[PDB]
Amino acid sequence: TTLLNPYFGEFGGMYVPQILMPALNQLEEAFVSAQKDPEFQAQFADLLKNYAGRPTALTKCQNITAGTRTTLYLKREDLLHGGAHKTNQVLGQALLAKRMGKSEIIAETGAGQHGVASALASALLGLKCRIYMGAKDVERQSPNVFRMRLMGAEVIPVHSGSATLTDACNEALRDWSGSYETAHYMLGTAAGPHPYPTIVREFQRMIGEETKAQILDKEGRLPDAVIACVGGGSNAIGMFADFINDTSVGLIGVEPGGHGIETGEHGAPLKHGRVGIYFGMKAPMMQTADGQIEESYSISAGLDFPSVGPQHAYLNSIGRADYVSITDDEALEAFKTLCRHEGIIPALESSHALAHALKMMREQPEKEQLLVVNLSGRGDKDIFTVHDILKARGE
Amino acid sequence: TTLLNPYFGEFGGMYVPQILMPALNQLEEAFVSAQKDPEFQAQFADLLKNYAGRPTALTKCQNITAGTRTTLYLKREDLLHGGAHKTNQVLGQALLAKRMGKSEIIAETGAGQHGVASALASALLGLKCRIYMGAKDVERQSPNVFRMRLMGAEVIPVHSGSATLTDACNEALRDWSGSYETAHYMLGTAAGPHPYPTIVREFQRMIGEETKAQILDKEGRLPDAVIACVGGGSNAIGMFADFINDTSVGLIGVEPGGHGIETGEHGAPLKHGRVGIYFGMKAPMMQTADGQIEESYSISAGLDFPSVGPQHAYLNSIGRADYVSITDDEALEAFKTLCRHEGIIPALESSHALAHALKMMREQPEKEQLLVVNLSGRGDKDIFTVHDILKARGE
Amino acid sequence: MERYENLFAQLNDRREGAFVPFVTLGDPGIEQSLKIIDTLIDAGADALELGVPFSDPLADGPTIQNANLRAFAAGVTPAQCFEMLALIREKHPTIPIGLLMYANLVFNNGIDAFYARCEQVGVDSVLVADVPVEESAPFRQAALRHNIAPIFICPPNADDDLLRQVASYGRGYTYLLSRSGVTGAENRPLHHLIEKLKEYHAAPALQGFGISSPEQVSAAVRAGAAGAISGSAIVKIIEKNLASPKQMLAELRSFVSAMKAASRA
Amino acid sequence: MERYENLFAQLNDRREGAFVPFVTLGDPGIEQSLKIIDTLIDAGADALELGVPFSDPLADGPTIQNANLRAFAAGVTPAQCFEMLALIREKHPTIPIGLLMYANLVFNNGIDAFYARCEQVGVDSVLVADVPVEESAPFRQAALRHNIAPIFICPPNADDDLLRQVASYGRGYTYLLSRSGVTGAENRPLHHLIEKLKEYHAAPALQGFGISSPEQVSAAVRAGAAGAISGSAIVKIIEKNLASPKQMLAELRSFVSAMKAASRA
Ligand SMILES: Cc1ncc(COP(=O)(O)O)c(C/N=C(\CNc2ccccc2O)C(=O)O)c1O
Ligand SMILES: Cc1ncc(COP(=O)(O)O)c(C/N=C(\CNc2ccccc2O)C(=O)O)c1O
Ligand SMILES: O=P(O)(O)OCCNS(=O)(=O)c1ccc(OC(F)(F)F)cc1
Ligand SMILES: O=P(O)(O)OCCNS(=O)(=O)c1ccc(OC(F)(F)F)cc1
Ligand SMILES: [Cl-]
Ligand SMILES: [Cl-]
Ligand SMILES: [Cl-]
Ligand SMILES: [Cl-]
Ligand SMILES: [Cl-]
Ligand SMILES: [Cl-]
Ligand SMILES: [Cl-]
Ligand SMILES: [Cl-]
Ligand SMILES: [Cl-]
Ligand SMILES: [Cl-]
Ligand SMILES: [Cl-]
Ligand SMILES: [Cl-]
Ligand SMILES: [Cl-]
Ligand SMILES: [Cl-]
Ligand SMILES: [Cl-]
Ligand SMILES: [Cl-]
Ligand SMILES: [Cl-]
Ligand SMILES: [Cl-]
Ligand SMILES: [Cl-]
Ligand SMILES: [Cl-]
Ligand SMILES: [Cl-]
Ligand SMILES: [Cl-]
Ligand SMILES: [Cs+]
Ligand SMILES: [Cs+]
Ligand SMILES: [Cs+]
Ligand SMILES: [Cs+]
Ligand SMILES: [Cs+]
């Protein structure tokens, strides 16, 4: 039994070896207890504000929407301490770990933003932190590898499989299955076995709560749509959550299209995969006809994952949220556009969200629409990858 | 004649070729007019808040002061858009440039944080931006070189002299002396000819104004001392300004000690140089017995400058502010301490300020004191320089 | 599931436990795998635990990860595994055959259709490593409708509710988990769990995860459990002799003989 | 400053302007510099503008930057420059000698002490490139107390207040600045400025910054100015012939002859 519903429609659940169920039930009750605890909430708020810098700005683009009837705001999670939204829920999970008497942290990372967030929260709060990261991602996001090691975290490159996020996820879970009495597994997205999809959403929902208050103050009304990239689902569900009951607000999640959906080299299982059981959850998966989990691809390490969180699969199924894809080339063009015309260097993950908003504007430039893009991180970790591309294509 | 006093005691002035005086007088009147203009101030405030992310957090250290009677807060300019306090006054100078009908920007940079700030403000506000940077600094701060070029700025390496900040300053001023009808020279610190020391202070004074309000709210009283690194003087005077009339508050500026003052390889002219005339101002200078301007040294490019702003020379002369130095090794130890025990990766420039506060605590650990460090930037630009050091010394 | 019932009856009338080796089907190739398994059975294996190659074996350490990879390097598909299972069953009509599955391979083409195919080829039990009792309902219902025993894990620190659930839901044998962690011969019983399972009328217990030497086998039988499973120790003998197929088989037969003997009281 | 007065009187009684070359003292070495300057004067230089090597010559483009560096490469100090100045004055008793200083070299050992040394070696004027009229008071007071003419720049777009200030404060000659920018022979008059300076009783005007060919010299004289200064064109002849000292001097003499001739109406 559980205290909370582990499913969103047919999606979710706790598909983990029996040995890990006490750990999951332990985490669920600690979360339920923390959510009712004024002292927990005040400590969490204190860290969000005074350590991480919340509330984050809501920036109105001027230049990139000129000559259209689109008004575009960027919710500036790139300004959060650590450089991405991943820091929000890590602070909350770290307080849950201390609440449970845990002293070590396990985490997976791909863009290395969740790893950086896990390392900085563990340094601040006195936890010992070890992080699995695919060897391919060690390379294309190497600034973050240095950053995690400078803060005292152990960084373990994973060379099996694709050497990307799936294999780091697998290694993390293998480790936790044999260290859970003393380690808390700080899962980095709104996926995995219950209660993680629920916990991660609640610990990221300030993204959308602030956005709602900010838009109402600046525009006197709700947005026509909010738009976020979807790697495992955390920044998108954090942006969506507070708008779910506002049925006029569109919710748009953007999956990586990689080299193009038709090439099969992409990271878009919600719209192009099929439901399966893996990473502790029933969710859309990229898989072979035989049920083998496929390798994903994205220029962006943070989106390069062959599955998706179960609340997004559910919101899609009932039609409350819509999901699209953006290719490597489209994300790169939006990256360049933002640097040059607004002076903000976005993460390549967030650039997928931006690219779709720019499409929405450009395709229908006389359509009146008020849009918010979740700018989930800054792009310092990407400048070397981007430079090698622009040089390969002669720029 | 001028509208405002160009001197702070004996220091300051306008020691520029006669050809540049109209440009300086033009800038002074535009500033005086902007400061009285509600619409200017509302536009500047709008950019500070909604684009750059102000107010910045005031973070209470927990771990690094444990077992002492020091309470230490960090004013988090590392969280500002662009990653350092340099962004504040750049937004204000860019609005002054538009107010004057200028369309191009010239700037110098050493740590590349002012260059990044100049490039991002020029992208946002529609100015064409070119930046001089010493070739040595091109290398040890190369992440910022990419960043400026991604935002559309032209980056010109300067190979003469030391190939550090002095030579970029010289090249910038040479350029402005022949392009001033169309370019605004966006000077990056509180030095140079009047009115820059005044303008830069007023456009950075929100650092100290916020700090005062934040400390009063959290502690119910003013700080015992505020502490800032001094490269040319802008983050320190921005922190100091609002406390100058609170005579109980100590003002402590920290110059780079480099390899040690006794080696002569340092960047501490206020305490170890002697007054001279150069970079358009009468100020303490590192110079030979003959009056040749000496080359400075610091592990930190942002502090590696053989002079200092004239308001700091004045505040020192009357005893209102005290100035100290911190060596390369001391700054590196404070860098490591902050990463590992608070989860914040500071700029090596700010690490000098932190190192002195940690000295103040460690030397007298039963002394009750409430301290604020100006954490002027984040350290992403330094991680490669720091890694090569830790490897050279076997870590 | 009747084959498990009959095996445990005869092992009872002989005062000995069961030795149950594990291999991944098709490691290092189909023909060598079938030959390996016959050698296991000839050397004295009482029952078999057989892994179907899966892309992401979460509960397996590097030894069995590399087994899965070798199989995939030989192009081994679940379909080919079912052809192998049919050939093994045809040679060995009374040997209990148990599968080690991951959930996506069961769910992929339809849970009922998976268990129906298991019944067609003569499989006796199915353990799905990443399905806890809390999610097991559609798997164990489909298992029973096709006369397949659903195997449930009894972990070291299980509570009473788990004990009663596993007793009532499982058939064939109860999987007595030696320890936390993942499979491996590099990381090495609880008598109280063995006896509570008996009181609740659970299927007989086999201990697994970390059993690599005859002493561990004798220890489990003495603790009152019905037998023991060894995967990685078997697999490494395969890994070490890839270039010597018949030196591999000689070493496998010697090892299994020693492990089987240790189960005889 | 009397030497300037007498030179402009005689140039008036001859219907010609002044040609005033510039070199950095000690470029490329002390002995070659003295020889260069004698060759300049023998070829027809009316007065001299002489730079003291400074570490950061803000108003100088790369040609004269490299002159400064060459001098420093020969170990040339301001002290050695004053010894050179004394040797030049001893050879040439009537030739006006003007220094191009940067402010820190004047302020360094004491402004009064700098001008006192200038008077001792026989310097006639001092232009401090980074001191505008707005900061000039202690420099021009010390200059006049030691019978040194303070030279002030009249820039292209000067207002009337500047014109009246420069007229009243300067002595010797007024520096008519050709254009914005820094020195150089790569980047190439205003008659209204020349005539307002006369009305206010300013010292006679010499044009500089960018004069590199005889035509530019003749143009300045025709515009009513009293002469013209060429630095970089002179300096590059030095730079190009560092390995041929006497080919250098031959080319210098030829060039100066042509520039001087152009000043003769
Ligand atoms: C700036 C930024 N913006 C968006 C994202 C997308 O992640 P999302 O908001 O959770 O959808 C990332 C993803 N980052 C990952 C992957 N994190 C991850 C992704 C998938 C499964 C497990 C994971 O730990 C990391 O490890 O840092 C990111 O860095
Ligand atoms: C994070 C950080 N923190 C502190 C500093 C020190 O500068 P300060 O606050 O002005 O004293 C820097 C200095 N940075 C410079 C030098 N800027 C500079 C320095 C000296 C003269 C001219 C300059 O443009 C830059 O160009 O980015 C910095 O990056
Ligand atoms: O002897 P070892 O260490 O190699 O272990 C052999 C295990 N092979 S197995 O099929 O019994 C087996 C049984 C259960 C497993 O996972 C689960 F417990 F979560 F269900 C995994 C493998
Ligand atoms: O012919 P060019 O281009 O080489 O110019 C030669 C100039 N040499 S100089 O001593 O007259 C001279 C005069 C004034 C200068 O700067 C100032 F105008 F700001 F004061 C610099 C050099
Ligand atoms: Cl269900
Ligand atoms: Cl709550
Ligand atoms: Cl509450
Ligand atoms: Cl509300
Ligand atoms: Cl409104
Ligand atoms: Cl395909
Ligand atoms: Cl299928
Ligand atoms: Cl799409
Ligand atoms: Cl419309
Ligand atoms: Cl004064
Ligand atoms: Cl004001
Ligand atoms: Cl006002
Ligand atoms: Cl107030
Ligand atoms: Cl208080
Ligand atoms: Cl020394
Ligand atoms: Cl001296
Ligand atoms: Cl000191
Ligand atoms: Cl005290
Ligand atoms: Cl047998
Ligand atoms: Cl039973
Ligand atoms: Cl002559
Ligand atoms: Cl006069
Ligand atoms: Cs803020
Ligand atoms: Cs618009
Ligand atoms: Cs994905
Ligand atoms: Cs303390
Ligand atoms: Cs300095």
Q: Whole-angstrom Cα distance, residue A187 to residue A196?
A: 7
**Residue A92 three-state SS:** helix
Which candidate from D58, D78, D154 shows the least CB-CB separation from B174? Answer: D58
Q: Whole-angstrom Cα distance, residue A55 to residue A57?
A: 7
Place of tokens 């009181």: C199
Specify whether D195 is catalytic. Answer: no
CB B215 within 8 A of CB B65: no
**Residue A14 three-state SS:** strand
Strand A183-185 versus strand A225-229 pairing type:
unpaired
Strand-pairing partners, residue B323, are B253
- Those residues whose C-beta lies under 8 Å from the C-beta of residue B73, and which sit 6 or more positions away, are B58, B59, B60, B61, B211, B214, B215, B218, B223, B370, B371, B372, B373
Q: Whole-angstrom Cα distance, residue B263 to residue B246?
A: 37
Q: Whole-angstrom Cα distance, residue B21 to residue B193?
A: 10
Query: Domain spanning A8-52+86-204 has what CATH number?
Result: 3.40.50.1100
For residue A238, give the H/E element and its range.
Answer: helix A234-240
Place of tokens 């070199």: D23
Burial of B245 (0-12, 13-18, 19+ CB in 10 A): exposed
Q: Whole-angstrom Cα distance, residue A173 to residue A166?
A: 11
Specify whether D60 is catalytic. Answer: yes
Q: Is B134 in the pocket of ligand 2 (CB under 6 A)?
A: no
Residue (of A80, A55, A113) closest to B378 by Cα position? A80
Q: Whole-angstrom Cα distance, residue A252 to residue A323?
A: 6
B362 inside 8 A of chain D by CB: no
- SS3 track for chain D: CHHHHHHHHHHHCCCECEEEEEEECCCCCHHHHHHHHHHHHHCCCCCEEEECCCCCCCCECHHHHHHHHHHHHCCCCHHHHHHHHHHHHHHCCCCCEEEEECHHHHHCCCHHHHHHHHHHHCCCEEEECCCCHHHCHHHHHHHHHCCCEECCEECCCCCHHHHHHHHHHCCCCEEEECCCCCECCCCCCCHHHHHHHHHCCCCCEEEECCCCCHHHHHHHHHCCCCEEEECHHHHHHHHHCCCCHHHHHHHHHHHHHHHHHHCEC
Strand-pairing partners, residue B265, are B260
Q: Whole-angstrom Cα distance, residue A307 to residue A286?
A: 7
Q: Whole-angstrom Cα distance, residue B133 to residue A140?
A: 27
Q: Whole-angstrom Cα distance, residue C58 to residue D140?
A: 86
Strand B11-15 versus strand B280-285 pairing type:
antiparallel
Torsion of CA A71, A72, A73, A76, to 10 degrees: -170
Query: Domain spanning A53-85+205-390 has what CATH number?
Result: 3.40.50.1100
Strand-pairing partners, residue A134, are A158
Q: Whole-angstrom Cα distance, residue D36 to residue D22?
A: 11
All structural domains of chain D with their residue ranges: 1-265
Q: Whole-angstrom Cα distance, residue A124 to residue A50?
A: 13
Residue (of A76, A30, A46) closest to A372 by Cα position? A76
Q: Is C42 left (phi over 0), alpha (psi -120 to 50) or beta?
A: alpha
Atom of ligand 3 nearest to the CA of C212: 1
D134 inside 8 A of chain B by CB: yes
Q: Whole-angstrom Cα distance, residue A352 to residue A356?
A: 6
- Determine whether the interchain pair A150/B50 forms a contact, defined as Cβ–Cβ distance below 8 Å: no
Half-sphere exposure of B373 (CA within 13 A, CB side): 31
**Residues in chain D within 8 Å Cβ distance of B291:** 78, 104-105, 107-109
Ordered alpha helix ranges (H), chain B:
21-35, 38-46, 86-99, 113-125, 135-140, 142-150, 165-176, 196-202, 206-219, 234-240, 269-272, 310-317, 328-342, 348-363, 383-392
CB B346 within 8 A of CB B302: no
Q: Whole-angstrom Cα distance, residue C250 to residue C245?
A: 9
Gaps in chain C following residue numbers (C to N > 2.5 A)? 188
**Residue B295 three-state SS:** coil
**Residue C128 three-state SS:** strand
Round to the nearest angstrom and report the end-to-end CA distance of chain D: 26
C113 inside 8 A of chain A by CB: no
| C175's tokens | 């999987």
C109 inside 8 A of chain A by CB: yes
**Residues in chain A within 8 Å Cβ distance of B79:** 53, 79-81
Strand order in the sheet with A7-8: A7-8, A11-15, A280-285, A274-278
**Residues in chain D within 8 Å Cβ distance of B25:** none
- Those residues whose C-beta lies under 8 Å from the C-beta of residue D77, and which sit 6 or more positions away, are B290, D53
Residue (of A142, A380, A141) closest to B143 by Cα position? A380
**Residues in chain C within 8 Å Cβ distance of A160:** 65
Ordered alpha helix ranges (H), B100-153:
113-125, 135-140, 142-150
| C94's tokens | 């009374």
Strand A154-158 versus strand A128-134 pairing type:
parallel
Q: In this structure, which residue's CA is closest to atom 5 in ligand 2?
A: B302
Nearest ligand, CA of residue B12? 14
Which candidate from A13, A179, A277 shows the least CB-CB separation from C104? Answer: A277
Strand C227-230 versus strand D18-24 pairing type:
unpaired
CB A226 within 8 A of CB A240: yes
Encode burial over C118-133: b for 16+ CB neighbours within 10 A, e otherwise: beebbbbbbbbbbbbb
**Residue B183 three-state SS:** strand
Place of tokens 């064109």: D233
Residue type, A174: R
Tell me the structure's resolution in angstroms, rounded to a single decimal: 1.8
Place of tokens 């992929």: C108
CB B360 within 8 A of CB B115: no
CB C207 within 8 A of CB C220: yes
For chains A and C, CB pairs below 8 A equal 89
Q: Whole-angstrom Cα distance, residue C185 to residue A337?
A: 55
- The CA-atom distances, in angstroms, between C30 and each of A62, B125, C82, C85, D108 are 64, 68, 11, 11, 91
| B274's tokens | 């002697």
Q: Whole-angstrom Cα distance, residue C78 to residue D115?
A: 98
Q: Enter the DSSP assignment of C15.
A: T
CB C175 within 8 A of CB C226: no
- The CA-atom distances, in angstroms, between B273 and each of B205, B266, B327, D215 are 27, 10, 16, 48
Catalytic-labelled residue, pool D60, D90, D124, D130: D60
Half-sphere exposure of D72 (CA within 13 A, CB side): 14
| B245's tokens | 């009339």
**Residues in chain A within 8 Å Cβ distance of B340:** 123, 150-152
Beta-sheet strands, E only, within A2-142: 7-8, 11-15, 58-60, 70-76, 104-109, 128-134
Q: Whole-angstrom Cα distance, residue B323 to residue B253?
A: 5
Residue (of D17, D38, D50) closest to D235 by Cα position? D50
For residue C251, give the H/E element and its range.
Answer: helix C245-262
For residue A90, give the H/E element and its range.
Answer: helix A86-99
Best D133, D157, D163, D180 residue to mutate vs chain B (most B CBs within 10 Å): D180
**Residue B373 three-state SS:** strand
Q: Find out whether the peptide bond into C62 is cis, omega within 30 degrees of 0.
A: no
Which candidate from B13, B179, B180 shows the least CB-CB separation from D135? Answer: B13
Q: Whole-angstrom Cα distance, residue D116 to residue D134?
A: 23
Q: Is C143 in the pocket of ligand 3 (CB under 6 A)?
A: no
Q: In terms of CA atoms, which chain B residue is nearest residue D177?
A: B19
Q: Whole-angstrom Cα distance, residue B193 to residue B15?
A: 6
CA R_g for chain D: 17
Residue (of A264, A224, A226) closest to A367 by Cα position? A224
* DSSP string for C20-84: EEEEETTSS-HHHHHHHHHHHHHTT-SSEEEEPP-S--TTB-HHHHHHHHHHHHTT--HHHHHHH
Residue type, A204: Q
Q: Whole-angstrom Cα distance, residue A143 to residue B387?
A: 11
Torsion of CA D247, D253, D258, D262, to 10 degrees: 150
- Determine whether the interchain pair D129/B17 forms a contact, defined as Cβ–Cβ distance below 8 Å: yes
| B333's tokens | 């130890």
Q: Whole-angstrom Cα distance, residue B46 to residue B34?
A: 15
Q: Find out whether the peptide bond into C21 is cis, omega within 30 degrees of 0.
A: no
- CB-CB neighbours of C12 under 10 Å: 12
Q: Whole-angstrom Cα distance, residue D139 to residue D108?
A: 12
CB A81 within 8 A of CB A377: no
Question: Which of C20, C173, C183 is the best mutation target for the ligand 3 pocket, counting ligand atoms within 8 Å of the beta carbon and taking the most?
Answer: C183
**Residue C184 three-state SS:** coil
Q: Whole-angstrom Cα distance, residue A347 to residue A345?
A: 7
- State the smallest CA–CA distance between residue A288 and chain B in angstroms: 40
CB B84 within 8 A of CB B176: no
Best A98, A339, A391 residue to mutate vs chain B (most B CBs within 10 Å): A339
**Residue B369 three-state SS:** strand
Burial of D258 (0-12, 13-18, 19+ CB in 10 A): middle
Best C25, C56, C107, C140 residue to mutate vs chain A (most A CBs within 10 Å): C56
CB B17 within 8 A of CB D58: yes
Q: Whole-angstrom Cα distance, residue B357 to residue C151?
A: 63
Q: Enter the DSSP assignment of C159.
A: -
- Those residues whose C-beta lies under 8 Å from the C-beta of residue D228, and which sit 6 or more positions away, are D17, D18, D19, D20, D206, D207, D208, D211, D216, D217, D220, D221, D263
CB A379 within 8 A of CB A140: no
From the CB coordinates, do chains A and D have 3 or more pairs under 8 Å? Answer: no
Residues of C with catalytic annotation? 49, 60
Residue (of A217, A184, A224) closest to A92 by Cα position? A184
CB C174 within 8 A of CB C166: yes
CB A298 within 8 A of CB A270: no
Start and end residues for every CATH 3.40.50.1100 domain found in chain A: 8-52+86-204, 53-85+205-390
Half-sphere exposure of C161 (CA within 13 A, CB side): 5
Q: In terms of CA atoms, which chain D residue is nearest residue B178?
A: D181
CB D99 within 8 A of CB D125: yes
* DSSP string for A17-42: -GGGHHHHHHHHHHHHHHHT-HHHHH
Residue type, A232: G
Q: Enter the DSSP assignment of B52.
A: I
**Residue A126 three-state SS:** coil
| A242's tokens | 């507070």
Experimentally, the structure was elucidated by X-ray
Q: Whole-angstrom Cα distance, residue D11 to residue D14?
A: 5
- Those residues whose C-beta lies under 8 Å from the C-beta of residue C161, and which sit 6 or more positions away, are none
| D153's tokens | 């720049």
CB A26 within 8 A of CB A38: no
Query: Torsions phi, psi of B162, nearest 5?
Result: -75, -15
Torsion of CA B36, B37, B43, B49, to 10 degrees: 30
**Residue A145 three-state SS:** helix
Instruction: Say how many Å lie between the CA of residue A306 and the centre of ligand 10.
Output: 15
- CB-CB neighbours of D111 under 10 Å: 17
Q: Enter the DSSP assignment of B82.
A: T
- Determine whether the interchain pair B290/D131 forms a contact, defined as Cβ–Cβ distance below 8 Å: no
| B33's tokens | 């007019």
Residue (of A386, A311, A306, A382) closest to A84 by Cα position? A382
Q: Enter the DSSP assignment of B84.
A: B
B302 inside 8 A of chain D by CB: no
Residue (of B299, B340, B353) closest to B73 by Cα position? B353
CA R_g for chain A: 19
Q: Whole-angstrom Cα distance, residue B283 to residue B278?
A: 8
Q: Whole-angstrom Cα distance, residue A229 to residue A259?
A: 17
CB A307 within 8 A of CB A285: yes
- Those residues whose C-beta lies under 8 Å from the C-beta of residue B64, and which sit 6 or more positions away, are B72, B337, B338, B341, B342, B358
Residues constituting chain C: 265
Query: Which fold does the domain C1-265 belong to in CATH?
Result: TIM Barrel (3.20.20)
Residue (of C42, C51, C41, C35) closest to C20 by Cα position? C41
**Residues in chain B within 8 Å Cβ distance of D79:** 290
CB A335 within 8 A of CB A346: yes
- Those residues whose C-beta lies under 8 Å from the C-beta of residue D9, and which sit 6 or more positions away, are none
- The CA-atom distances, in angstroms, between A270 and each of A191, A262, A287, D34 are 13, 15, 12, 84
- CB-CB neighbours of C193 under 10 Å: 24
- Determine whether the interchain pair A18/C65 forms a contact, defined as Cβ–Cβ distance below 8 Å: no
Q: Whole-angstrom Cα distance, residue C15 to residue C248?
A: 31
Question: Which of B113, B164, B229 is the best mutation target for the ligand 2 pocket, counting ligand atoms within 8 Å of the beta carbon and taking the most?
Answer: B113
